[PDB]
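Quick one, probably user error.
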């Protein structure tokens, strides 16, 4: 559920992101994707922390991750203006 990113920094104590922003080593910060990224050395370990809903109608519903508030939502593929049904997310 996670994925490594090749750090673009020449600093062994700081990792550089795509936005050119650097973070202190062993530090865990969060981005727009409300993910958790830790600066190792030459590779940042990032992972998704957005709760994934389940139990919805796979034939009458879909999962769309909103980047506005960084949270999962489920709407009727037939009705994108309405919600579905979830029995409990997972992470």
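Nope, works fine. Designed sequence:
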């Amino acid at each position: 559920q996670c994925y490594f990113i090749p750090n673009q920094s020449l600093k062994p104590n700081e990792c550089q992101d795509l936005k050119g922003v650097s973070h202190p080593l062993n530090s865990v910060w969060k981005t727009k994707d409300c993910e958790e990224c830790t600066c190792g050395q030459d590779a940042i370990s990032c992972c998704n922390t957005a709760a994934i809903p389940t139990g919805y109608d796979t034939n009458k519903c879909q999962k769309i991750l909103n980047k506005k508030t960084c949270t999962y939502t489920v709407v009727e593929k037939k009705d994108p203006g309405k919600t579905c049904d979830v029995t409990g997310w997972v992470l």
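Residues 50-91 form a domain with the N-terminal domain of TfIIb fold (CATH 2.20.25.590).
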